[PDB]
Design a protein around this ligand. Sequence first.
Ligand SMILES: NC(=O)c1ccc[n+]([C@@H]2O[C@H](COP(=O)([O-])OP(=O)(O)OC[C@H]3O[C@@H](n4cnc5c(N)ncnc54)[C@H](O)[C@@H]3O)[C@@H](O)[C@H]2O)c1
Ligand SMILES: NC(=O)c1ccc[n+]([C@@H]2O[C@H](COP(=O)([O-])OP(=O)(O)OC[C@H]3O[C@@H](n4cnc5c(N)ncnc54)[C@H](O)[C@@H]3O)[C@@H](O)[C@H]2O)c1
Lengths: 459, 459
Amino acid sequence: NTKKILFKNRFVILGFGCVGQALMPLIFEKFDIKPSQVTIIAAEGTKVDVAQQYGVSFKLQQITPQNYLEVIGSTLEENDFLIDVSIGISSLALIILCNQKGALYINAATEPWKERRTNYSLREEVLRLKDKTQKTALITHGANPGLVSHFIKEALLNIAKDNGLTINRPKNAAEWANLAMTLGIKVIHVAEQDSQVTYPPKSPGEFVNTWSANGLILEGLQPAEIGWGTHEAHWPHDAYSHSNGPQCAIYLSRPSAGVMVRSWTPTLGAFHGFLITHAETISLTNFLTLKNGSELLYRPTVHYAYNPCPDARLSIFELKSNEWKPQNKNRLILNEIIDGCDELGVLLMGNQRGAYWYGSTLSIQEARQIAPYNNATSLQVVASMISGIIWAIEHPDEGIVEPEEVDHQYIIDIAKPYLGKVGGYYTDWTPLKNRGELYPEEVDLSDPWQFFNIRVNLE
Amino acid sequence: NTKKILFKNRFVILGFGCVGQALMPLIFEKFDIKPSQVTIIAAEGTKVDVAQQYGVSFKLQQITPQNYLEVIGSTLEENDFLIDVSIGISSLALIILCNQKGALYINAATEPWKERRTNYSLREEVLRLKDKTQKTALITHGANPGLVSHFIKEALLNIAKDNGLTINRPKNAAEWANLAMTLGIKVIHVAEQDSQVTYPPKSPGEFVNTWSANGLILEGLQPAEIGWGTHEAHWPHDAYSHSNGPQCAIYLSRPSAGVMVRSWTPTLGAFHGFLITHAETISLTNFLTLKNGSELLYRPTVHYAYNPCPDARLSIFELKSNEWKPQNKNRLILNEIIDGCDELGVLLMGNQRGAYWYGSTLSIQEARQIAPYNNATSLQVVASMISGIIWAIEHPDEGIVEPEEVDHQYIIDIAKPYLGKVGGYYTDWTPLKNRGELYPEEVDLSDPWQFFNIRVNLE
Ligand SMILES: NC(=O)c1ccc[n+]([C@@H]2O[C@H](COP(=O)([O-])OP(=O)(O)OC[C@H]3O[C@@H](n4cnc5c(N)ncnc54)[C@H](O)[C@@H]3O)[C@@H](O)[C@H]2O)c1
Ligand SMILES: NC(=O)c1ccc[n+]([C@@H]2O[C@H](COP(=O)([O-])OP(=O)(O)OC[C@H]3O[C@@H](n4cnc5c(N)ncnc54)[C@H](O)[C@@H]3O)[C@@H](O)[C@H]2O)c1
């Protein structure tokens, strides 16, 4: 362990689900810590023996607004680290508490107390505390949101070198936005394709996924969310904006799981992914926005193009089939998967060099030799977190920070050993070619990167 | 073999694909015939040893318009039987030829010479030969079209007894139509749900199905075909009719594989099937039509509500994903399926007793103990054919006949031992209940059996 980071404090992880269990291995792999320096608090037990294998204390308790101050508060000392991988617990409340205790904090997503509140408010509510806390609190730092932000910056620089351009690594958001515009980026996709298959096959009455079934279901139930790029010359018939909501975002009536978009992945290529909504859509869009003051000049279109594992495809199909009524049973496929991989990455379109995709292609085989209690999907998420956790430790006083404010190279260099083959790929693909002729869909030959061409319109 | 039918002639089967191979077992199971009394002609060989196991001659040859008269003609003697289970060969041409040779004939679907010609013309072209040939030629007599017609008549009678009504088994079409109307049948669905799963999982780049991948693909590519019932009070926005085409049919712009309809099956229940087009839609509709002369009085809505095996679901998904470009590879799942069943049947809606579903629920396990080279799907198709073949032998001089003109009880009693559990099921289900509320779809509370409520409208 020549790279084993020394840690004299303790790790308090609340929640022990899909993410939490998969994190365990990476913590003891990167830290020369004792199991006694780790404690877990969760509301529901588990049929898994992860905690027992590592010998980490596990407390069965439900965290509420009435007891979190005492239960969680009495567990954090100055310099401790609260790894938040729970659901239904106020990130805002936990963040403030950590600051008071002088403890570090991280999460893979901003969450409110268990009770439909917009994903916008939740972020602004906690973001409007930038200059209030001192201790570092890294938010929404998972594979995506999270790692994805670091992939965009990496790609932005690679495309620059491949264009002959030679500049300095940008610092502020404005410079990053400027580099995006100078490169002709009209649209950025978070293009992922999960090909993990399993055995035995799927059974009726259950939602099967490589990660939280409820997370996917909830996201697919909400209306399509899209960062509107300044190049867009067409307005979706079923689209609408919020006068007071985010100025950069546009929404669609239909549920995100009911909207398909044309994207691209290196391993399989052109495909139709679900335009599943996400948090880092508005944050990334604004991060790459440009203006002279109160007049926007540039802004790319940003949204998710997801294609889950075949089992999750069958699940969504069954979900709609049940009139959007979620199956009475959920299942996380881990050991049952026998083959496949997860291609998570970002697609930047617009530059003359051609569409560019930079990301991680991790197979289940490599993921299993790298760490237990992990599949291709989970491993990419915890790889990002363990990196973010290490970042916060050597930068404990940065206040509330988002992945966009973190140096991509630092994170990528730590996570890379956990992401299988990672790199960029150029392609001459566009949503305008390989088109069919059975049913001619109206297209805009003028600019292939128009949402009008990407969205799969039934009519 | 106390029920082994004696046959002194020969069986000429052209084509040896999904259906043909699966038929072999049933022929030697129901006939005390010698293998020398069987001959097979097909264009493509096979990696299967079905012919070799039974010791039946196999001739590798492509049948064309220029050689069919000699190749096929020299193989048929008076009273012989040509089992047509090929593709791309003119049924009309084969039918006439058989008559000239005084040989019997049967097929599971009407086909033209290999070359997009409407399914309507093909039927009328051959149907306009009713009083021209003497020898019996049973057409479109597979599971569906075919067995399905016999299930409708069976259900029609069962609902009558369950209604207290006591009449005589109707003969002509008018009487059958009349019974349908007197029973309040507003809509009839061919509701099927294939749950056969497999191992190993599906691979990218291939269309996997329990039956012909190309058959499903072709059907899903054509526009939705629907028998318009007289009760329908709503007109689909994307619908249209053919002034000269079939008066009872209505079409939809979108491809059939792009239209979902709400139906019901006993084993799983309410589901969303693909409104895949078929042949027996127009024939059944007219068969249940009523009028005083030139003014229609009654006619139910008739269409298919199909839900293929999960692998075929993933296949269709990938098909659309490839812009309707069929995968470069096709695969028929037979031995790889490990569990599941095929629920093929008909749903009659409108009667006060409630929706009624009568059909066959055959599992892969029962199908394997019943016959080799068969899965749940194939077995239901060949069960119908072997029954139809037996029918034609004792009725060799009936001319061109359709399954609607055949006594359902005769067929059902022969096939029943091949269909697993077969029977009727009542249900209080309607496309109006168990509805969701996330996205309220406009419905007509006045009459749940309105196509307006059954078709899953995205908006
Ligand atoms: N950025 C990414 O790539 C990414 C990927 C996956 C998940 N996530 C985020 O990670 C999360 C972590 O959850 P997960 O996916 O493992 O879900 P999960 O539902 O599998 O586990 C959540 C755990 O939190 C606990 N929790 C819920 N209520 C609690 C309560 N009252 N008291 C104490 N603990 C409670 C549960 O008991 C459970 O063990 C979510 O917030 C999700 O949005 C981010
Ligand atoms: N009613 C039903 O439930 C039902 C179900 C399935 C299939 N069918 C019908 O059955 C059919 C039989 O085909 P299948 O599904 O086995 O398809 P298939 O493609 O698997 O096999 C068809 C066979 O026909 C042969 N054929 C094609 N061209 C030929 C030529 N030029 N000369 C000689 N033979 C030729 C092929 O070589 C092949 O072996 C189709 O017509 C289909 O519509 C009906």
